[PDB]
Structure formats: C-alpha cells, structure tokens
Ligand binder design. Structure first.
Ligand SMILES: *[C@@H]1O[C@H](CO)[C@@H](O[C@@H]2O[C@H](CO)[C@@H](O[C@@H]3O[C@H](CO[C@H]4O[C@H](CO[C@H]5O[C@H](CO)[C@@H](O)[C@H](O)[C@@H]5O)[C@@H](O)[C@H](O[C@H]5O[C@H](CO)[C@@H](O)[C@H](O)[C@@H]5O[C@H]5O[C@H](CO)[C@@H](O)[C@H](O)[C@@H]5O)[C@@H]4O)[C@@H](O)[C@H](O[C@H]4O[C@H](CO)[C@@H](O)[C@H](O)[C@@H]4O[C@H]4O[C@H](CO)[C@@H](O)[C@H](O)[C@@H]4O[C@H]4O[C@H](CO)[C@@H](O)[C@H](O)[C@@H]4O)[C@@H]3O)[C@H](O)[C@H]2NC(C)=O)[C@H](O)[C@H]1NC(C)=O
Ligand SMILES: *[C@@H]1O[C@H](CO)[C@@H](O)[C@H](O)[C@H]1NC(C)=O
Lengths: 202, 58
C-alpha cells in the first residue's frame, strides 16, 4: 500500500488543479450540521458546527490495484491538491485539532477523492429585527472557491445536500429551527464570476 | 548509551505512519482510559462545560 502512495505522489504537482487545461473541476459538497449555535443578535452573527465534505475527481491519483480504496487521516491532505473553498459570510471560522486534525481523506482507484473536515463557523446574519419578538429570519451560510472562477471550479449539491441531527441538542436559546434550504448562484467580482452556494436556515 | 541510540535510530526504518497497524490484516483495537483531574465549571449561558483530563490510549 505504501508503494501505491509513493507512486501516486511521484511527479505530482499539488499547485495545479485537476483538468487545469481541459474543463472545470466539478466538486460535490455535503454538510452535516451538528449544531446551529446561539444566534448573537448584538453582533448579527450565529455559530454553526458542521462536518463539511467535498468530493472531486483527480486523474493523477488513479491507481490500479485490488485494494480499490485508500482510507487516510489528515497526513496526506497537504500533499495533494485541495479546493480553495471558503465561507463568504464567516466572521470567524476554525478547524479542530484535538486530539489530531479532524480531517479525513479517501481516494478510490478510479481517482475519486473525498475530503472531509469538521468546522466551527461564526457566520454573519443581518437580522431584520422589525416585528421583534414576532420576527422570523432565514440566516444564510455561503461558500465558494476563493481563487478559482466558475470556469475552473464548479460546485454541485448532492441529493442528500444538508443533513441535520436531532435539533433538540442544538444551542438555540431564542429561536426554533423551522426549516432548511440550499441554493446555487453565480456572483460576479473583480476577480471573476464564482459559483457561490448558500444554505439558508429558517 | 550506544545501544539506546542504536535502538531508537533504527526503530522507524521502513515505517509508514500513513497506515494504521494491522492494515488489511486485523482491526486496530484501542484501549481508552480517562482520569478527570478536575470537572471544570459548567456554563449555562453556552451549554458548555470544561473538563481537565489525562487521556490514555493503548
Ligand atoms: C503572523 O504570524 C502568525 C504566527 O504567529 C501566522 O499564523 C500562523 O500561520 C501558519 C500557517 O502559515 C499556521 O501554521 C500551521 O498550522 C497547522 C496546524 O495547526 C496549527 O494551528 C492549530 C490551530 O491554530 C489556530 O488556533 C486558534 C483558532 O482555533 C487561533 O489561535 C488561530 O486561528 C490559529 O491559527 C493548532 O491547534 C496547532 O497546534 C499543533 O498541532 C499541529 C497539528 O498539525 C502542529 O502542526 C503544530 O505544530 C502544533 O503542535 C505542537 O503544539 C501542540 C500544542 O499546541 C502540541 O500538542 C504538539 O505536540 C506540538 O508541539 C498548530 O499550531 C499545521 O497543520 C500546519 O502544518 C503544516 O505546515 C505546512 C503545510 O503544508 C507543512 O510544511 C508542515 O509540515 C505541516 O503540514 C503537515 O501537517 C499537516 C497536518 O497533519 C498535514 O495535513 C500536511 O500534509 C503535512 O504533513 C506532512 O509533514 C509532516 C511534517 O511536517 C509529517 O509529519 C506528515 O507525515 C506529512 O508528511 C502549519 O504549521 C500557524 O499555526 C499560525 N499561527 C497562529 C495563528 O498562531 C501568520 O500567518 C503570520 N502573518 C501572516 C499574514 O503571514
Ligand atoms: C438542494 O439542491 C439539490 C439540487 O439542487 C436538490 O435536489 C435538493 O432538493 C435541495 N435541497 C432542499 C430543497 O432542501
């Protein structure tokens, strides 16, 4: 198995995305929300803890063998190309490093890479406090690639896009979790046009 | 002494830390033990509580 990893890493330039000259790199995203933390109306923000998973294809990481899947901890996460995904409306976000880096990397023989990590995000939510305490909100959580425009990275939601746990173990003091939805948009910036995706929690 | 250094230096010869023990042979069993040196304060304003632990894994 070490031979397979050594062969995969040989002549591998992690600075270049897969299919850099051929087509956009399609990424399939999933979220499991452990807990939407408290909504801090003073600072117009809310905390959320997620397992964020991204799946893409890397032709360079194809390997022919009978193993058919390499399941790995964070050790090789820095050794290969990873998407530039970042959360647009995150005032402060942190990964988790106790006991070890809370990251997972699975590579299939056909070149499919699944990369999962645990995140805690303090996402901005501009609450319209008219009708308070009868007010209702739809707080977003947006993300996109920082550097790669739509012509280079394209995100896609899967069927089981966003999943939630019990929702009674969540830290919502004031509000009740009404519902959820997901959306995709293309946002134009000075750098270019980026495939943004939002998850709205009502 | 010399034998200690020789044992330590040659220990990681041909060792791949990317692979778990007994990969493709068995299931890695881990024995866990916790010694809570102090049960820290419980915060109602956060649904958060602190706990200082000696965490042992074998
Ligand atoms: C101005 O100056 C500041 C600094 O003052 C600077 O900010 C600094 O930026 C750097 C990045 O440029 C950042 O370093 C990296 O940290 C990564 C790990 O986490 C470190 O941070 C976490 C959390 O930090 C955040 O914490 C708060 C929020 O939660 C808040 O303060 C901040 O947001 C802060 O960022 C922290 O928990 C970590 O603690 C430890 O655990 C790490 C585990 O990976 C370990 O690396 C650390 O050394 C550290 O462990 C020691 O300390 C703990 C106790 O704290 C002990 O328990 C341990 O025993 C240790 O004594 C870290 O502090 C880290 O992953 C990055 O490491 C990689 O760096 C490059 C990446 O390509 C490689 O060269 C490195 O080798 C390494 O990559 C390897 O490891 C990763 C992780 O497993 C793998 O995925 C990679 O594939 C790769 O693996 C390979 O190599 C290793 C050998 O190296 C090999 O073993 C493997 O097999 C494999 O081959 C990187 O170190 C730094 O933390 C940050 N400092 C701050 C903010 O305080 C600013 O940028 C400067 N200004 C500007 C604008 O430039
Ligand atoms: C998320 O998006 C996918 C594809 O766009 C869709 O199938 C799914 O129903 C959406 N989730 C909702 C509406 O909760």
């Amino acid at each position: 198995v070490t031979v397979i990893l050594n062969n995969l890493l040989e002549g591998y330039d992690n600075k270049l995305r897969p299919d850099i000259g051929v087509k956009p790199t399609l990424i399939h995203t999933d979220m499991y929300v452990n807990s939407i933390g408290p909504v801090n109306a003073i600072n117009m923000e809310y905390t959320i803890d997620i397992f964020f998973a991204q799946t893409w294809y890397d032709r360079r990481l194809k390997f022919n063998s009978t193993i058919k899947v390499l399941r790995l901890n964070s050790n090789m996460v820095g050794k290969i190309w990873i998407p530039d995904t970042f959360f647009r409306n995150s005032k402060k976000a942190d990964a988790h490093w106790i006991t070890t880096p809370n990251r997972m990397l699975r590579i299939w023989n056909d070149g499919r890479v699944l990369y999962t990590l645990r995140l805690t995000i303090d996402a901005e939510c501009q609450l319209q406090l008219h009708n308070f305490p009868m007010d209702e909100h739809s707080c977003p959580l947006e993300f996109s690639s920082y550097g790669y425009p739509r012509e280079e990275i394209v995100y896609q939601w899967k069927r089981s896009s966003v999943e939630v746990g019990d929702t009674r173990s969540w830290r919502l003091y004031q509000f009740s979790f009404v519902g959820l939805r997901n959306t995709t948009e293309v946002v134009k910036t000075t750098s270019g046009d980026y495939v943004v995706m939002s998850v709205y929690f009502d | 002494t010399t034998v200690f250094t020789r044992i330590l230096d040659r220990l990681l010869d041909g060792y791949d830390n990317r692979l778990r023990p007994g990969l493709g042979e068995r299931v890695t069993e881990v024995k866990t033990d916790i010694f809570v040196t102090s049960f820290g304060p419980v915060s109602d304003h956060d649904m958060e509580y602190t706990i200082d632990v000696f965490f042992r894994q074998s």
